[PDB]
Design a protein around this ligand. Structure first.
Ligand code: 537
Length: 347
């Protein structure tokens, strides 16, 4: 009595439990391919993500295992919830693919970016974003890899962050995105919680300009786009850079960097009225507090959530609450990773 059936979607095959019906493509990325589907058991729509051979490389396998262990433990209204996990393969020897069933959303942030939002929507999206980051932080997790493709939303303006971020060489088709990586994390500097504020900043700025703030072919080219617009960091900051780095950085063409009002003119914001003009200045202020090269001066999540522009949706229940009560860290080989993932999936 088999409980699986296969269907073609995109240029790949999905083999799932019969409960999942009428699958339909909805995008793809690095971690894998995703589908939309109706779940007859729960009588609702779900998102089904297929991880093909997650154990193929160390990093890829650590990501899968981690996301899998944390997706069952944490449970915040802004973190994507895992509904079910399964593999069609029935023995460790044959074990190949893993399927994650999650709540279905209507679009990722890349799409939202392509459009304009009113101050009310934009601030709400940002509120939920920072709120999710605060929950992760209080659980000892610091993302460090927040980007628009990792965030999804629904029509009712609800938002959820997908993966849990970062914890070897790679040549796979997976892009080398790093446009959203904080400066300190780039120049090998150490980092802290507020390292995520920089990403939110890049994302917020991108939702306003509708363009990647810092387009960089390579981590070297990116640093330029950063300095050009934001200007060169203060000497003190440099004193904090490693010799090998402070050298390259301090010998890099200096820059004044365009002011914030210029970087985010009133034309990118609704200037309908005084209320909107006032809201546009408060957004600009928030951006100038998050897009700070030197983290020492960059605002924190708790402060960002109190910012006038965001404060509007504050709620002491969704912010200050008791976070969740197996955390690996040892490197393993492909084979060990495959059994670890398999045992996890099989429980
Ligand atoms: O990539 C998407 C995605 C992309 C566009 C629209 C909805 C979703 C969506 N809804 N739930 C999940 C769970 C994981 C990934 C994704 C989703």
């Amino acid at each position: 009595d088999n409980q699986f059936y296969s269907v073609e979607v995109g240029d790949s095959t999905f083999t799932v439990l019969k409960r999942y019906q009428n699958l339909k493509p909805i995008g793809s990325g690095a971690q894998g391919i995703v589908c939309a589907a109706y779940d007859a058991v729960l009588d609702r729509n779900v998102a089904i993500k297929k991880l093909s051979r997650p154990f193929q490389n160390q990093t890829h396998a650590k990501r899968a295992y981690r996301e899998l262990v944390l997706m069952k433990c944490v449970n915040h209204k802004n973190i994507i919830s895992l509904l079910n996990v399964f593999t069609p393969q029935k023995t460790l020897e044959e074990f190949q693919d893993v399927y994650l069933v999650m709540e279905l959303m209507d679009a990722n942030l890349c799409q939202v970016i392509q459009m304009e939002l009113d101050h009310e929507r934009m601030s709400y999206l940002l509120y939920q974003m920072l709120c999710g980051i605060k929950h992760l932080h209080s659980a000892g997790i610091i993302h460090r890899d927040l980007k628009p493709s990792n965030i999804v939303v629904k029509s009712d303006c609800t938002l959820k962050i997908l993966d849990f971020g970062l914890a070897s060489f790679m040549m796979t088709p997976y892009v080398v995105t790093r446009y959203y990586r904080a400066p300190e994390v780039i120049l090998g500097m150490g980092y802290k919680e507020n390292v995520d504020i920089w990403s939110v900043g890049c994302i917020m700025g991108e939702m306003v300009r509708h363009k990647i703030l810092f387009p960089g072919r390579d981590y070297i080219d990116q640093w330029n786009k950063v300095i050009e617009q934001l200007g060169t960091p203060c000497p003190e900051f440099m004193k904090k850079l490693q010799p090998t780095v402070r050298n390259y950085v301090e010998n890099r063409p200096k820059y004044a960097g365009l002011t914030f009002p210029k970087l985010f003119p009133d034309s990118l914001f609704p200037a309908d009225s005084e209320h909107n003009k006032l809201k546009a200045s408060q957004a600009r202020d928030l951006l100038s507090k998050m897009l700070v090269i030197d983290p020492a001066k960059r605002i924190s999540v708790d402060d960002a959530l109190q910012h006038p522009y965001i404060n509007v949706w504050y709620d002491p229940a969704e912010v200050e609450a008791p976070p969740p009560q197996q955390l690996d860290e040892r490197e393993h080989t492909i084979e060990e990773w495959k059994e670890l993932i398999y045992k996890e999936v099989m429980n």
